[PDB]
A paper describes a structure:
Topoisomerases are essential enzymes needed to relieve topological problems when the DNA double helix is unwound for both DNA replication and transcription. Topoisomerases are divided into type I topoisomerases, which introduce single-stranded DNA breaks to modify the DNA topology, and type II topoisomerases, which modify the topology by introducing double-stranded DNA breaks. Most bacteria possess two type IIA topoisomerases, DNA gyrase and topo IV. While DNA gyrase can uniquely introduce negative supercoils into DNA, topo IV has good decatenase activity.
Herein, we describe a 2.8 Å X-ray crystal structure of zoliflodacin in a DNA cleavage complex with S. aureus DNA gyrase. Crystals of zoliflodacin in a complex with a 20-mer DNA homoduplex (20-447T) and S. aureus DNA gyrase were grown by a microbatch crystallization method, and a 2.8 Å dataset was collected on beamline I24 at Diamond Light Source. The 20-447T DNA homoduplex contains 18 base-pairs and a G-T mismatch at either end of the DNA. The structure shows two zoliflodacins binding in the cleaved DNA, physically blocking religation. The DNA has been cleaved by and is covalently attached to tyrosine 123A from the GyrA subunit (and to the symmetry related tyrosine 123A’, from the second GyrA subunit in the complex). Catalytic metal ions (normally Mg2+ in bacteria) are required for DNA cleavage, and in our structure we can see two Mn2+ ions occupying the ‘B-site’ in the GyrB and GyrB’ subunits. In particular, the terminal oxygen of the pyrimidinetrione makes a hydrogen bond with the main-chain NH of aspartic acid B437. However, the residues on GyrB, which partly form the DNA gyrase–zoliflodacin binding interactions, are conserved not only in the bacterial type IIA topoisomerases but also in the human enzymes. As shown in the sequence alignment in Figure 5 and in Figure 4a, zoliflodacin recognizes and interacts with the GD from the conserved EGDSA motif and the RG from the PLRGK (or PLKGK in Gram-negative DNA gyrases).
Residue numbers in the entry:
A (entry chain AAA): 9 to 490
B (entry chain CCC): 10 to 490
C (entry chain DDD), D (entry chain BBB): 417 to 545, 580 to 639
The structure:
Amino acid sequence: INERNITSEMRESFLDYAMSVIVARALPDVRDGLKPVHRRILYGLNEQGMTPDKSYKKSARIVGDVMGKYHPHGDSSIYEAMVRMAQDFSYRYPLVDGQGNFGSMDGDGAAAMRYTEARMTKITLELLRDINKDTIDFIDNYDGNEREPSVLPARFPNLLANGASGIAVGMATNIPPHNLTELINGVLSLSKNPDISIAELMEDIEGPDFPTAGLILGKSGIRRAYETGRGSIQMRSRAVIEERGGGRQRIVVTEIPFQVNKARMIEKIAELVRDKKIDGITDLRDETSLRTGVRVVIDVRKDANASVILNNLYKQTPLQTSFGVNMIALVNGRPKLINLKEALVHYLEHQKTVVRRRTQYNLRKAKDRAHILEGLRIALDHIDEIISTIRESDTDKVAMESLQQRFKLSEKQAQAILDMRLRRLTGLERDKIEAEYNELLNYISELETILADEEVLLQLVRDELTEIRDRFGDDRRTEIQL
Amino acid sequence: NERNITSEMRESFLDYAMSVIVARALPDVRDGLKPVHRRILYGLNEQGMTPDKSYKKSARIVGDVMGKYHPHGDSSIYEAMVRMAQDFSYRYPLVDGQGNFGSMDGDGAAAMRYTEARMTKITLELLRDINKDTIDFIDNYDGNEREPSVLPARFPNLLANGASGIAVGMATNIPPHNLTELINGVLSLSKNPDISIAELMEDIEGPDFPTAGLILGKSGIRRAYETGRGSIQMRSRAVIEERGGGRQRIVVTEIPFQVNKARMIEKIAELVRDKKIDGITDLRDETSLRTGVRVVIDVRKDANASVILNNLYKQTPLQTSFGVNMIALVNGRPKLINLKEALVHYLEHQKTVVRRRTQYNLRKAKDRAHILEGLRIALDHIDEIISTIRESDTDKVAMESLQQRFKLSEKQAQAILDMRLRRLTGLERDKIEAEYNELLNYISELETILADEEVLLQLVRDELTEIRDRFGDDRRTEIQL
Amino acid sequence: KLADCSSKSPEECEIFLVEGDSAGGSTKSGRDSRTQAILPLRGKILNVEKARLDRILNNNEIRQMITAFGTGIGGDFDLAKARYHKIVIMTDADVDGAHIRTLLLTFFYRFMRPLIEAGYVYIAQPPTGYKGLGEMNADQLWETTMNPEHRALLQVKLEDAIEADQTFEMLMGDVVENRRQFIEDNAVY
Amino acid sequence: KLADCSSKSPEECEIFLVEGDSAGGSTKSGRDSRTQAILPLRGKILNVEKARLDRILNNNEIRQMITAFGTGIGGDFDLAKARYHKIVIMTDADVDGAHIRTLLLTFFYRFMRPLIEAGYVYIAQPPTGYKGLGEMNADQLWETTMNPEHRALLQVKLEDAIEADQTFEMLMGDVVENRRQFIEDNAVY
DNA sequence: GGCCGTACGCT
DNA sequence: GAGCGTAC
DNA sequence: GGCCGTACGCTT
DNA sequence: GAGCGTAC
Ligand SMILES: C[C@@H]1CN2c3c(cc4c(N5C(=O)OC[C@@H]5C)noc4c3F)CC3(C(=O)NC(=O)NC3=O)[C@H]2[C@H](C)O1
Ligand SMILES: C[C@@H]1CN2c3c(cc4c(N5C(=O)OC[C@@H]5C)noc4c3F)CC3(C(=O)NC(=O)NC3=O)[C@H]2[C@H](C)O1
Ligand SMILES: [Mn+2]
Ligand SMILES: [Mn+2]
Ligand SMILES: [Mn+2]
Ligand code: NA
């Protein structure tokens, strides 16, 4: 049976758990900004043909697919992550399009997965774009039965776009979401200047942009975040003071801070009132509706200073909150604390690689296709001999051999001739082959241009980024006040 | 608008009652299945979960059956499938499960996340020839799938595995039987339309519970097979044996069908505590995955163990009745049937299935024969074929030229245009000629079957007999007196 | 768990008896919180016509409604203690939703009969199809079933109490035979 | 609760600590009931090296173990009362099952240290599959991990307390920094 | 269908 | 009369 | 991962 | 604080 040491058991077994949580559960890769469960869900939606045009699919079956295929964990770990990706108060750029009940800011969960359906969002397709053009490196899944991607092409800078929170072992992460327009502009600036300072980059990227909007007090917390990877940022709700009639006033809250549960936050304010720990509040009403949007109302007692009641609610409730920036991501499969430029750098590099690989892959396929078309041309030009040769032959092997000797055709070219359908012999068809060959030759030339010059490839990256910004970039939601 | 409560009550209740009856609680008399079962099996089929292929996560199976056919709670789907995998539940289990699928002690199965299944070899027999126009398909709930109205069911599954279900205004309770005896009874029936229940009972002795046991008397079984309603006394297999030192014990090794062993054991222990049964010193379950069911009742020295046994019969589920109420769906109507009606309806189903299959294979042979006739002509006159194509500027033109010049159907002509060049080599030409000749013998064989009502029937009896020889097993339940 | 509305004015308020917790959750977001209160029902509820009064009274589901309605029951019913002028039954457009209906209407006709005669009881009509209430969005549940401006509630009436007694007794009674006969007399396969 | 060994005799009786309820249930149906008891653990248990003693003594999992071992804890620990001579750690062959393994050993080391010396504490060798303990058969679990015949056990051995003290505090302690550094220094990617 | 334990880091 | 098995 | 509600009928 | 979000 044999023995085992306890100090050695603790170190080995603990180091296995830790690295695993670090590199394969809790932290996002710098390139696509995804944790494993996220990457697998989106890839799963991709391998099931769950694109925006297609109909919704039961969440039960999505999760079940991702579970048995790529993600050998409990199902609620999958489903809940997929539900996060589907909420517009969670994701600055939602990655899942859900149908049914998928929760609210009041912290009410989503219905169980048998009550819901899902599919990709249109912005998600950008994460998956060109995944099938040898752009990223695939690997074997757990049961060695499937293949799954190591990273997505991620045609937009998704780590900063949606941000990350994740508790590892020995470290955690916290990256706030950003405005996609400002983020891409940043990349475009960096692309035409490898030596840009954070100070300059900040002229594109003003700072976080939360889905739940609200205010951020001061640019100083943001600057410390962007230069070092760590800094505290001050999130304040959007509240105003207005009259309610009879010379009395109320506070009206319309945007609450990020990741703050609305329900809980209101119950806190209520507590401070029973406990008599704040003065001047007569009523607390949640008037939020699907048509009004968020609206918490706090009725102030007559001849109490509302502005003073407000500044105390900031100090005393989650009406004002901190976002503790701690930008840790996987960089070359290792956790690194990165600053803004480091993040943007690892991303643009990725795009160059993705686009280079795609252009390379396209060239292999065009060059391979042109080769067949040359053989088909030859065959159609010498068709009567071609046919004779085949009928004369007793086997493929023999027919292959003759065709290759008579016309000097490659093995692949001959194979393509034998596979040809009779209908390709009509007069119209021959001319089509000519066109396709001509178009291909143009294409091959364009592709060689891109690979020949690093500058041209990079401009193409710039141009494809500029299209995403034009199609998907939106206005900043969160106001940054000084 | 405004609505009358007596009208609303009558229509709401009738909507529900009818639904539970024809689409939930009662089995169809042909394949012996309720909707949820039919769907789990048809699901396993569509997802390619065949006995050779490896086991699939239960969650994914349940999810597909729920998404495509059965729009109900996940739990109602999984627990039905779990039942179909238990050898103490199904006389001939339909699902082959890997993982924890429960036991006699009423311990449930592990959640579906932790179990894998595929179909059993016998389930292949339920779905045999499903895709040969043997049974009518129907639109599902979301109009996005087709589902079988009934399964081909190439063995008589309603009586084999039995059925129990609570409907509204009725319920059903049909016991399992021995497959060898049922098939012998269907063959008997197939050679004598006017056979009595009494003569059929020379083949089908009585129920055959997966849990074995003893049935006391034949008269409850006779009343059930004759009216469709009846009571059957099932008794445990207990013996009395010396345990050493003049002392004795009762060893129970088979329990009644549908009796929770655990609950039965606690029931005895509770009688012993409350001093309401005399003479028992110990109660141990020595049942292992290796020894079989073994419940030992130790008996205090010099007590009468035969009296204790009798009293354990009187007070515990060590003796239990099974109450027969053979109500199945017959032309999608609920109907009380006897042994013969059940086997009559089944044989008919098997005839229509063998007919429709033969009828479908014939059409597909004629179709393919016609194509090969087309290809043969082309091979014959290949030079001219090539010409007529080459001299056409569009495939549409070639299609019409080909049909005119060689008197081909539109289908024959399209087939020829599709034909790749490699099909002109020596061997590929021979394969065509060889296919055609084998195909013509086949058509003559099929038309033989469809030419005589008796050849069709003998083929039915032959395919039943084959199933009986591969799948039939020994009786488990003893029928005493 | 009941999620109450803002106004305590019975005259202007309405209560939705919803089938299932997932529909409970969906309903609470989509509603107008100032005038619409929601009390989930977890599945099939006690059939009072078959049950014993001690049981009928100590039942969570049956009780929770007494509290919410707050009017007492049986002999002790006060037509005027009612906390909602609209009692709406909201069930799936399927057979199980229709069974839960027959169960609720059994409950009312026996324990809060004055309430129906008052015309305080209404049957919603969610979109017809293969989608249950739990499976829908909160915005689609509002705009189609709950919104006063585009909803088609059916008020419940009783012209006859004698025929209504024999009806609740034949359909929901414990004599199965009367129930079995009604099917065979009325069933269209 | 724990399913106990029919045998009364501590000398011959073994307890399996099984990760998860599905694995527990299957284990019960598979084990030789004469000498093998089964105490399931619902997921991760408490990290005592970070918890104060009041929380520790209130933990269900921790309390079920103390009970079952019946040997008291800390100062009040007396080997003589031990109800099993073999205590087995049976977890999945995954990183999580290794986490739970390090948790249980933390508890043993800090509370039942005496027991480790006595070497009653063992670690099962389940099939190093892709599968976990909850996805196997009882007969698969029986003859691979439990059958006293064809099974292999790692008996846990302590051989330097000063080394063990520093290690349990660095790995399972509340200071994250030192833990971050041991990861930084020994992790090979 | 919901209700509930734990680890892990950070503020 | 009690717990069988599909439903919410 | 388990715990628990309810309807529904039944052996002449 | 206790709760952010992947795990059992
Ligand atoms: C496997 C479970 C069984 N169910 C139980 C229900 C209720 C209870 C239940 N209850 C209880 O004991 O007190 C309150 C409630 C009545 N304990 O265990 C239960 C279910 F398993 C009703 C049920 C539910 O949980 N939620 C629904 O909205 N709809 C349903 O039909 C239902 C659910 C859908 O499925
Ligand atoms: C979504 C749930 C969360 N879990 C809870 C656990 C435990 C509890 C739990 N309790 C517990 O552990 O002791 C006291 C209290 C009853 N309450 O709620 C829980 C889960 F949701 C541990 C869990 C389980 O339920 N059983 C397992 O065998 N393994 C697991 O990982 C786990 C399960 C697998 O998944
Ligand atoms: Mn000819
Ligand atoms: Mn429904
Ligand atoms: Mn595991
Ligand atoms: Na604050």
